[PDB]
């Protein structure tokens, strides 16, 4: 019942269970708990789009640039998935805007690839490197052209 | 496809591989997840048996194309996801150029809400001093093209393609993949027009893992018609 608070919290943040997260935090759960792969509650709440849990985890000091084994940070996850407000928040809490997953993607890379204009715009505003290259030498520009997202391309051009 | 809907959001993934090359016996397990909206796959793999006898990059190809991103315009050629959830079989023979071959049989399906890939692998006619078994490929993977031909003869998919593995010295080793996929169920299924799948991959090592293992990040998109 009070065993394995860290797993229980990971689960709750994956499942968007706000009331369970509240309890677990107020009752001692490690806010930076991590499974075998370095996945943390904040990675899971960022990926699955659960904002209230994201806000709360950061107020108890969730490490905002924690890195899983695939070099992903919650910022990459939220930026891949399209969660604009969550991106906004992680940036306001000092998320490393030019962080690298293991293919050398930056969240700008990910966001242009996946067709999230407003998230791009917001990453540019917080200091994203437009020329940065993945390990296959692509740029967020290319990736955006690969995928057919002209307006994103049009944008990246201007910086 | 009704089966495509099943790939909305994140799906956990289990992988199990039973193996024998030139009589060296081995077992691999993996887990992680995938996200077919973005062709993304996030995995880690363990050799449960000891040292692995062949190099990790030989297995990549053999260790769930249900997760490849098919864009709206190419949805009618997504065989793998139309065969879900009853799944498909995937058989392959992989010839390494001046060295042995792998034969693989695999069932890919939903058990529970877990997409699981269970593999038997027989390798034969390899050189105990050659690239494979002499551990001489580097820990590495490039960006490849995987061509899909419809295979009406079997209600499935024939596929040629070739991958190149960098060797420790500047040399390159070719692996010629011949593939057949047939549905497990007898429900209707989609037969693709010819297309390339294009890949990015990154192999890494987990710091706190003592066993012989590979961490794998991978993105995959169907890029076009022939």
Numbering used by the authors:
A (entry chain B): 10 to 168
B (entry chain A): 2 to 64, 68 to 230
The authors write:
DARPins are engineered proteins that consist of 4–5 structurally similar repeats that stack on top of each other, forming a compact protein domain. DARPins combine all potential advantages of single domain binders over antibodies: they are small in size (ca. 18 kDa), possess high biophysical stability, have very high expression yields in E. coli, can easily be genetically encoded for in vivo applications and are devoid of disulphides and hence well suited for applications where they are expressed in the reducing cytoplasm. Structural investigations showed that these DARPins bind to different but slightly overlapping epitopes.
Surprisingly, SEC-MALS revealed that 3G124nc had a dimeric fraction of approximately one third, in contrast to the original 3G124, which was predominantly monomeric. 3G124nc did not show a clear transition up to 92 °C, a stability which is not unusual for full-length DARPins with three internal repeats and an optimized C-cap. Thermal denaturation of several GFP-clamps was assessed; they show a transition between 68.7 °C and 71.8 °C. This probably corresponds to the melting of the truncated DARPin domain, whereas 3G124nc remains folded in the investigated temperature range. All hydrogen bonds except two (GFP-residue Gln204 to Asp143 and His114 of eGFP) are also found in the complex structures of the parental DARPins with eGFP. The structures of the GFP-clamps confirm the intended design: both DARPin-derived domains overlay well with the parental DARPins when superimposed on eGFP. Most interactions between the DARPins and eGFP are found in the single DARPin complexes as well as in the GFP-clamp complexes, confirming that both domains can bind their respective epitope without strain or steric hindrance.
